[PDB]
């Protein structure tokens, strides 16, 4: 595609403007990372329950973090912000989104339909309608076109690792999505085949295996600890044969850096 490079450059320009604040959680007086992790985990179930695209999920998480970057939110209203975000994401990415009623339904009438509709409106003001955010999922898609041959266990597993990173704001909030996606691809490739971050992609991204190292270290930890984590929605998801069961594969015990 004649624009495929332009897109990549343009996605790299946009990821910097869509960045949440680094340490927003600690000026947030009533909530924390641990409860952000419960929310996001919940969002994975809602996506599975309604057969949403993975992208809708990445989008919603971007909106939530950007919103919590400038608004204090009480714990009893956290789920409302998340549920409004998943609605906007679905409206943006899905061919036909689930009705508001269904979004009200998954909360157990913990909020009313109007409350959701007013939150949608509030989220839209705060993000000033900037909904077209680049996501780890997007860069992975671009990176996959540089694999020989196409190996779909590596694709599934790189997706899987990128989803895990949604759950924990510390540390993953301090990496751009292009970096997390690089780290996930290397790690997935390394794990299935013993291969390495290809030259084609170093040339494309200007990212050496060496500049991935800090993020690749974290993702190795995460991958290793994954069966132990409080949140398990994602592992549940990636056991499906639809993902070639990559959630079941054994992480390697060293990165060999």
């Amino acid at each position: 595609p004649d624009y495929h490079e332009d897109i990549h450059t343009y996605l790299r320009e946009m990821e910097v403007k869509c960045k949440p604040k680094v340490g927003y959680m600690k000026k947030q007086p009533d909530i924390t990372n641990s409860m952000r992790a419960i929310l996001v985990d919940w969002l994975v179930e809602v996506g599975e329950e309604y057969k949403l695209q993975n992208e809708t999920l990445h989008l919603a998480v971007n909106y939530i973090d950007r919103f919590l970057s400038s608004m204090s939110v009480l714990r009893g209203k956290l789920q409302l912000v998340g549920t409004a975000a998943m609605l906007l994401a679905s409206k943006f990415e899905e061919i036909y989104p689930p009705e508001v009623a269904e979004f009200v339904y998954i909360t157990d009438d913990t909020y009313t339909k109007k409350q959701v509709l007013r939150m949608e409106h509030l989220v839209l003001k705060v993000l000033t309608f900037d909904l077209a955010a680049p996501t780890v999922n997007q860069f992975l898609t671009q990176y996959f076109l540089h694999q020989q041959p196409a190996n779909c266990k590596v694709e599934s597993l790189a997706m899987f690792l990128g989803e895990l990173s949604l759950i924990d704001a510390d540390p993953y909030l301090k990496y751009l999505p292009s970096v997390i996606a690089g780290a996930a691809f290397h790690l997935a490739l390394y794990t299935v085949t013993g291969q390495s971050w290809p030259e084609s992609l170093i040339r494309k991204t200007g990212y050496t295996l060496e500049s991935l190292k800090p993020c690749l270290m974290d993702l190795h930890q995460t991958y290793l600890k994954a069966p132990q984590h409080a949140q398990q929605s994602i592992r549940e998801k990636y056991k499906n044969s639809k993902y070639h069961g990559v959630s079941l594969l054994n992480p390697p015990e060293t990165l060999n850096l």
Binding site: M35, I38, L39, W42, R75, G76, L78, Q79, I106, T107, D108, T110
Partner: peptide, 4 residues
Amino acid sequence: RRXF
């Protein structure tokens, strides 16, 4: 489910 409700949730925190």
